[PDB]
Amino acid sequence: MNWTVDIPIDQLPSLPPLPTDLRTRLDAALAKPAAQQPTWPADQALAMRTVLESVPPVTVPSEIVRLQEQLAQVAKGEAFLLQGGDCAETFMDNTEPHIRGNVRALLQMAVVLTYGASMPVVKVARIAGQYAKPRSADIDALGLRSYRGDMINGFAPDAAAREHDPSRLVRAYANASAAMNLVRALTSSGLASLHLVHDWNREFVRTSPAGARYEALATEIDRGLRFMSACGVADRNLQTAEIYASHEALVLDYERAMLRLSDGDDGEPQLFDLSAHTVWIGERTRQIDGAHIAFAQVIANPVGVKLGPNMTPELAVEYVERLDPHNKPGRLTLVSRMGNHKVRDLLPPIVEKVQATGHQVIWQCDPMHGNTHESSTGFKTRHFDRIVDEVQGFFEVHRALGTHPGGIHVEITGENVTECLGGAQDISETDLAGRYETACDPRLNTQQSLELAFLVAEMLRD
Amino acid sequence: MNWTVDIPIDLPPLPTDLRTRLDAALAKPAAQQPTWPADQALAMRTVLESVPPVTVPSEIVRLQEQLAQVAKGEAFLLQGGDCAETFMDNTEPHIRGNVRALLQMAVVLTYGASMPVVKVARIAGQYAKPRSADIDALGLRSYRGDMINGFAPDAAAREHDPSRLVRAYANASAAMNLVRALTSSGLASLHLVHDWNREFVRTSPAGARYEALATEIDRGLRFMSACGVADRNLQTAEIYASHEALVLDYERAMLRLSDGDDGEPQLFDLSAHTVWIGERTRQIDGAHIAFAQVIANPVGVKLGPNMTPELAVEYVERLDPHNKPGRLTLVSRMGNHKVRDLLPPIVEKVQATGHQVIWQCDPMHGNTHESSTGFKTRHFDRIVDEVQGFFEVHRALGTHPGGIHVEITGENVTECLGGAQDISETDLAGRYETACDPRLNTQQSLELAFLVAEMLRD
Amino acid sequence: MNWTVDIPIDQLPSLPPLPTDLRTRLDAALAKPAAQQPTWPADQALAMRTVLESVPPVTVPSEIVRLQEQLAQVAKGEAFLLQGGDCAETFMDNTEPHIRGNVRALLQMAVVLTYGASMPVVKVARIAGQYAKPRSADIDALGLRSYRGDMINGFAPDAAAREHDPSRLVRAYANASAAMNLVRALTSSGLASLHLVHDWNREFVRTSPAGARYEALATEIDRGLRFMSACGVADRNLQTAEIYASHEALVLDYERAMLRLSDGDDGEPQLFDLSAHTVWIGERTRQIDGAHIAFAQVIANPVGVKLGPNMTPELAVEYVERLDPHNKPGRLTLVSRMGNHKVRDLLPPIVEKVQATGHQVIWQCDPMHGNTHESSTGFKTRHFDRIVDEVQGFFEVHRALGTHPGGIHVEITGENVTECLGGAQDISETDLAGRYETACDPRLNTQQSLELAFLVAEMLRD
Amino acid sequence: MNWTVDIPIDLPPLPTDLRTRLDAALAKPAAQQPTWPADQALAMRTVLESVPPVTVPSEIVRLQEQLAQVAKGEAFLLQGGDCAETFMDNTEPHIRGNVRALLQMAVVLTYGASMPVVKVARIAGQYAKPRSADIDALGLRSYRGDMINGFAPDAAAREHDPSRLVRAYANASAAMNLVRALTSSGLASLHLVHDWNREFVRTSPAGARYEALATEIDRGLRFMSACGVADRNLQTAEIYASHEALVLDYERAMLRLSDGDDGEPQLFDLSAHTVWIGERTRQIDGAHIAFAQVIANPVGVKLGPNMTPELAVEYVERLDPHNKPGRLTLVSRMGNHKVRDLLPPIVEKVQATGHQVIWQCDPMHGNTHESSTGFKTRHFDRIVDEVQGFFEVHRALGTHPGGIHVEITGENVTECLGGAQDISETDLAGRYETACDPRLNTQQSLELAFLVAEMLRD
Ligand SMILES: N[C@H](Cc1ccccc1)C(=O)O
Ligand SMILES: N[C@H](Cc1ccccc1)C(=O)O
Ligand SMILES: N[C@H](Cc1ccccc1)C(=O)O
Ligand SMILES: N[C@H](Cc1ccccc1)C(=O)O
Ligand SMILES: [Cl-]
Ligand SMILES: [Cl-]
Ligand SMILES: [Cl-]
Ligand SMILES: [Cl-]
Ligand SMILES: [Cl-]
Ligand SMILES: [Cl-]
Ligand SMILES: [Cl-]
Ligand SMILES: [Cl-]
Ligand SMILES: [Cl-]
Ligand SMILES: [Cl-]
Ligand SMILES: [Mn+2]
Ligand SMILES: [Mn+2]
Ligand SMILES: [Mn+2]
Ligand SMILES: [Mn+2]
């Protein structure tokens, strides 16, 4: 009568434990205080962690070392990073059509951005694990315990669903592994075929109210593709498209149980977080002496740190020295989210000070999380013009300083939602009640995200 | 303890004929099904109708083309893995081992056959088995694989539990993710795979017998490299997923309808790339055969010693009505003592129909006996001999010995007798770990690939 | 004291003769009257032919069957033919720098045209054998026997040099084979590298007086190339560029001694003319019952026929039926040279009548040979605007009829000559005396030819 | 009769140092040169300064990189063709045969070596030879190859004629055009080339001895194909042109200056890709060695039984002053009876210098004798044995046996004694067609490739 099915888990034999030396390092790191963690009992968390220690990984080390090399190129100014997907993934919407939509939107943006940048685009999805979020307050407008993502509790507004349930750590892995199996399948079959992808852009150009504005660039791209074909370059020549998985490393019970030690065939064994390919640390959990930063020191994965308007140049240097102690280009990404009214003033000093350290970080724009406001109709929202403008300001800072505008980080979807105001749709406050489906922040819908890619490409062409 | 899934309180409807044909198939009698309550099965089916598929249609169409080459005599099929996967052993080391053993056998067979080898694993779903008796030798309700019931000999664990339909998908999907990750990784690199054959040659008691062929293979690989062919030039290694389509509650919930980018909409079973129908579930007017008629996936049918040439024609005509080479595989499982006498007349009739099926040898399931120590077992020499007889039948008739279907593992278990290890009946109790039939261990499967390669060379 | 060296030839053992059946066919064909042939003695011609029967061929059959397949695509509307080079090759200018220049110009035009057409361009050079020309009158303005090309006599204005010398048949082969060895070498090494070729177009855009007009398309092409690179397509992926050799089959003594019989490994043996890959028959030698047309019936090579303003639709059908009796697309090319003032009127009926036959010919524009006039400064010349305009009219005829404008045939050079009037240079009648170096017709210089390619590409884009 | 070329009554000037170094090299004494008048040589040189080159610089830089791999022990060099090309036999069938034999030997050697084979033909220029006596056994002025004089034994034909400088370029250029055409054609297709080995195995008297290796090679090729590697995947077959740089009037007129797209301007001899300096022209302060110092081409030096370890070091230091691996090849030609004793100490000293040269065996030129029937000849067993001794020296020292340099033809001549054909002294008069030294025929060269492949396998 709860409309729910229960899946038993047996406490099955664990694989040989992690080596004692790394466990000691790891235990030292997680002794530090950890903001934003779930409040579930510890014996129960341990039981779920023991299950996760034994499951097949979501990613494998060799894919992560591959990503590291591709991101190294981004840091050196010869590549561009595209990172995008849902603000919050839900288990109920973790379906083939939704997954296919988001993959498709990301591929569409990537080809437009590749042409604009005239250099390779690394495609990183917010997918297969983006199931946890922080909150500012512990009581929401409905008087309930806050929703903190499907890894922690349920979205539905009732007390039973909002209690912190550690079994969701395993339900999270099941959904993540299944989502990733599908991403891998899609990217290695027709969906990622270049000539198929631009034909979607041709449907966008015909059915956009501002399609006449983007016709020139769309046509230009189409002729670049036919040029390749005409020069005797076929699909299988290009090779399969690669879409990496990422999420905010927020719930340490999950991330630590997904840790694995590498083969040692490559050379030296090391701890990888195999819940994803890359992870980032959020604005509310980046305490310099906190457990999240310390966790990121111990793992080999490429990492990111969100930098909001309170950031100082000095604190940014500390992040560079702690998270890139061996000076590996593209190991650390700094993700500026300042707001379009503040980025032109606040970012330059941070960039200058970090460049002076001699490290090579990736400068990445998040034009979303600095530009959120509430509408008069009641829906939390963002304006497309303000999103565009911060990317514009981001690029101007780098063009002025002679540094690399290394990528973008956006919240998008392949669904035709009504969540962000503006775009060629020119969506209104009234329109938001039509299809407002996000479980957290508002996303660019399929048309808007494409429109944004076209605009960021023109910024790459200047 | 438990994790919990929300049934969707809440997908555009099937074309009318497919709905009609699907209902008609599943209305027919079905052997070997679980006995759990319908309202619970329905709830599980509704969850599985919403999950991301294990495979996609374009992969199955691709498999269909590659299998067509096998049917035509221009490729060879290698199918292998656990007799029964367990949720307990669905781990990275176990999956990686089985993937590795298959890749190793494959390269040896490629070289011996002088033609491409299609690699199909029994994996990411092989969670159900049929039984002859519903009461086992301990007086318990029989184990029928982790989809239906638990391996442990306890009444409570043997109860049929429909929540295992969803746990089985969770494990299948997680396993397939890893298979895809590994196969795009180095693990599938030709040069890496050959270096495992060197380890085997050095640490086998019969290594000296397989050295000449191993050295010849190694030189074949270095020749490619010297002619200017690098890893990245090669097409990425492809390992397809298969299992027996046994539990119809599972297979029907994993059905999806294709797009119209390539022809008319069709039903694909996306729990796997290819499935087969077993000896006990193969009734000509039963639900399993009829389900196979409605799905677009390539299929196989197991054929034992009671098979007639006439029944075989009927299977081909029902399951390959449009004469699509490689859509149907006939899986011969006769026993080494009977295959030479029983297979030829079946092959002759089927060839005369004009259809192009893949003839595949299963040398395992016709050669089981019980040891004096108490473990059910197979002798390595009997396994080799059925494949040998299978090859002779096809050489004599001039037809294509199209492939093998074997139960193997990448661990050094002690389940099948013999091989260069000369495993005795006493040795079986050391590492007998299978949840059902005895598998060739890592050395024995490798030994078999070498021996079958020589059969391909003659 | 004649400033000349004599190279002995020994009458060395001939290879086994051609088979008797083909020789009988061939003898029947060459019994027909042959316009424009040299007047040298027959015993002497025989001696040189016997030498040529024994030499290594300029081309090989498998290359010609390859060309046939590529031209088949042109005829079916999925490819474009570029044919170009000197009006008349001279032995004295058959040098590495001159050869490299012409190859380079052709490659430059090809990449611009490939992008414009969005389909593959077959590159055929007028090279390695274009050493013979017809004449209208037998006495030139200087009162001497006419120059008829280096295969026949010398350009210098003196009686000794103008006598018809059959040893030039062998000197012609020596130069042809040597030129081709170099073309093969250049095309299989860096010169034909796509990314190298467009950088020359970047030097053209900067140093053309009309460079600002062609900047947009040049930039667009450059971004198409970087797109390929960014998608992970390297040089060796594309494969080596192919440049085929062609000339007017005019001197039958030469063409018939260069005939060879194919291996028979492909299937059926057949006569190929191995002096070139493809040859064409000129306006003054295309007598329907003449030896040139009959010769073209017997060889397996792809052929062309020049169609001037006197052409009728009926006579064009006869050419199609005689030269394409087995209906092989791209085996026959019809080369319209009408003049820009006449093409829009005269070509349409010819096209309609030939389409009605059911054959698939290649429609090729020669905008040069219909637009020649004499300047007030004394130099035979052509105006760039009139050349451009006939290609324009050619395209309009095909766009109107729904048929394929299959290619162009031009006389160009990689030298900065002053021979054709106009272009962005806007060369004048006065300017012609600067660098007028052609041994026959005026050629588009390096800048003009490129300018023409840019203009024909825009015609392909509409 | 004759064709006639216009000397150009009428090229931007060489950098001052290159001019200086070139003049200084050619001012030194030069052995074995033709004795024709200077004003006529100058006129011929002026014509050749204007012709399209036989090779281009980027091909030579490419050859230099591939030869570097040989020097490092990661590739093998095959060099072969006519002892002396003739203008009379410079025909399509003769060129195609020699190209074919080289491609055939190459694939066998690739498989035996398990590493890439650089293919260098003696072709498109091998028109000059040295002589010990200026009067031959008939009392005529000696034949010195078609560049200088005619083969026929007539005083008039033996006169040194400088017009042969231009006739030699004409033939060289025409031959190279065809080589390039053939190598981009099917003729260079791996699968085609192996089918010629099958013909050889069936129609050799010793075919049964080479069948196992032939079958193994065939299976190596089918393995590539089965792993999804097609012709078009492979890099196009490359055959480089070489000859002895003997006639300095020829080589100097064929010099061209490079561009600055890759470093400083340099002189390339574009009559070939690589050239070598012979035993009789190898004087340390002579014009040939000094000419070799000024050109960018990879070079070789022939080393006979009088060679010292010390003189060898001097050649390496003069010819590889910048320590560029594979820029220099040392070509051992000792005699099968002497190579085991005479080569080791030379190899030891040269290795100690720190330079990386290619050690190449010439098993031909140390093993000539005169038969009782009157034809100069070599025995197949002696040729094989020098290569065998050459391999032993390098195995014992742990150095790289880098290649072979042989005189072969794609026609079945009767010039060298022995082989599976067991050609006798009586048989020599059947088809003795060489214009100088006896060449291994089409069967014998192939037989040698097989035998050298086994030496590479041990
Ligand atoms: N949509 C998934 C169903 C699912 C079950 C098991 C694994 C993966 C997904 C959920 O509701 O949690
Ligand atoms: N061995 C698996 C662990 C697992 C849990 C959830 C999903 C997938 C796998 C099980 O006990 O079910
Ligand atoms: N430029 C050539 C020289 C040449 C000679 C021989 C062969 C090819 C070219 C000529 O004057 O005829
Ligand atoms: N065999 C050649 C024929 C030849 C002539 C001219 C150029 C090239 C080759 C000769 O007698 O010189
Ligand atoms: Cl907190
Ligand atoms: Cl890995
Ligand atoms: Cl709230
Ligand atoms: Cl039953
Ligand atoms: Cl699909
Ligand atoms: Cl006339
Ligand atoms: Cl050919
Ligand atoms: Cl005149
Ligand atoms: Cl001398
Ligand atoms: Cl070059
Ligand atoms: Mn968000
Ligand atoms: Mn079994
Ligand atoms: Mn002309
Ligand atoms: Mn010799």
Author numbering:
A (entry chain A), C (entry chain A): 1 to 462
B (entry chain B), D (entry chain B): 1 to 10, 15 to 462
From the paper:
Previous studies revealed a sophisticated synergistic allosteric regulation of DAH7PS from Mycobacterium tuberculosis (MtuDAH7PS) by binary or ternary combinations of the three aromatic amino acids, Phe, Tyr and Trp. Crystal structures of MtuDAH7PS in complex with different combinations of aromatic amino acids revealed three distinctive allosteric binding sites located at the dimer and tetramer interfaces of the enzyme, formed by accessory elements to the basic barrel.
The binding modes of all three aromatic d-amino acids in the Phe site are very similar to the binding modes of the respective l-enantiomers. The configuration of the ligand does not appear to significantly influence the conformation of the MtuDAH7PS residues that form the Phe binding site. For all aromatic d-amino acids, the amino and carboxy moieties project into the same binding pockets as the respective moieties of the l-amino acids. d-Phe binds to the Phe site in a very similar binding mode as the l-enantiomer, the root mean square deviation (RMSD) between the position of d-Phe and l-Phe ligands is 1.46 Å. However, high atomic displacement factors and poor electron density for the N-terminal region in the d-Trp bound structure suggest that flexibility of this region might be increased upon ligand binding. The only major difference in binding mode when comparing aromatic amino acids of l-configuration with their respective d-enantiomers is the lack of a hydrogen bonding interaction between the amino moiety of the d-configured ligands and the sidechain carbonyl of Asn175 on MtuDAH7PS (highlighted in red in Fig 4). The distance of the amino group of the ligand to the side-chain carbonyl group of Asn175 increases from 2.8 Å to 3.6 Å (l-Phe versus d-Phe), 2.6 Å to 3.7 Å (l-Trp versus d-Trp) and 2.7 Å to 3.6 Å (l-Tyr versus d-Tyr), respectively. The only significant difference between the binding mode of l-Phe and d-Phe in site 1 is the lack of a hydrogen bond between d-Phe and the Asn175 side-chain carbonyl. This may indicate that the ligand in site 1 needs to establish a contact to Asn175 in order for transmission of a signal from site 1 to either site 2 or the active site to occur. The affinity of d-Phe to the enzyme is only slightly lower when compared with the natural enantiomer: the dissociation constant (Kd) of d-Phe from MtuDAH7PS was determined as 93 ± 5 μM.
